[PDB]
Ligand binder design. Sequence first.
Ligand code: MIX
Ligand code: MIX
Length: 273
Amino acid sequence: PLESQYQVGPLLGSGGFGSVYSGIRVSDNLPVAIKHVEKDRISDWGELPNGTRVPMEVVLLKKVSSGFSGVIRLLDWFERPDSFVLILERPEPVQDLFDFITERGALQEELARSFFWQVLEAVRHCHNCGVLHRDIKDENILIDLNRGELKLIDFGSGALLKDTVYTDFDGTRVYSPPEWIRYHRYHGRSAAVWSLGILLYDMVCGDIPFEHDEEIIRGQVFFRQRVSSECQHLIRWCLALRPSDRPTFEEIQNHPWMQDVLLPQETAEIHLH
Ligand SMILES: O=C1c2c(O)ccc(O)c2C(=O)c2c(NCCNCCO)ccc(NCCNCCO)c21
Ligand SMILES: O=C1c2c(O)ccc(O)c2C(=O)c2c(NCCNCCO)ccc(NCCNCCO)c21
């Protein structure tokens, strides 16, 4: 039922997470992405309502895929003998935020404020649906080039949101909070806020702030680019060393720098058309 309902196009990516292909649904020609994950490499399983044994990513994608948001939706999934196959939305034309920043260098503040805000909305929606992504970064963000809408993509290192400590981490190191580096333990919200601080610095600086553990643990932030007294403050607050000194989502979104965000459409008009 799988290779009959969907027509595979070119490979889009591959790596730790598996392989992703461009796809068309025959039913009607909606762009889709086809994500192959091999059973052997799944470290983390869950179970759906009806109680089947699936990869966590599927559990998580299902909890966030209801209604609209800034998260790319799971349209359907299939099991095979050595792999799971996931059918997801595909914006058209699309480019990931990594390449986007790579191409234009640092982003104008107005453009960063728009993008960052949309990320905030997406992460809120996930936190809301009891999901924690745990790997927010430029390359897990797709941009729908036409509508100026951002979308989150890879739940592979995700986990259900819970209020107790986490002692496993699979996201990228350079993006991991100092409490992880030092103690091999973190809480979800505050660690998300840290990575959001990394994401924001990246957007405005062209680059990430820290590379090596000692730089992460030190937590000192240098700007290689002109950035407003105020973005610098928000970035620094997100990257506070002590988790409890970081802002909540709400405080981020009420930050002076987050005022008068653009809508995605006008963002595209001004910065993508
Ligand atoms: O295109 C997707 C994609 C999609 O279109 C719809 C849903 C999805 O879940 C994906 C997707 O997961 C994807 C890639 N996997 C995530 C890489 N994460 C690295 C872990 O740190 C890795 C690469 C990838 N290709 C994006 C296109 N990149 C070139 C233009 O920037 C994708
Ligand atoms: O994404 C990584 C990265 C990763 O995903 C996994 C392992 C890694 O070691 C990196 C990484 O080193 C990296 C960058 N280099 C760090 C040096 N910058 C601060 C000076 O210490 C500098 C930038 C960077 N991200 C690219 C940001 N997007 C714009 C493209 O230039 C990375």
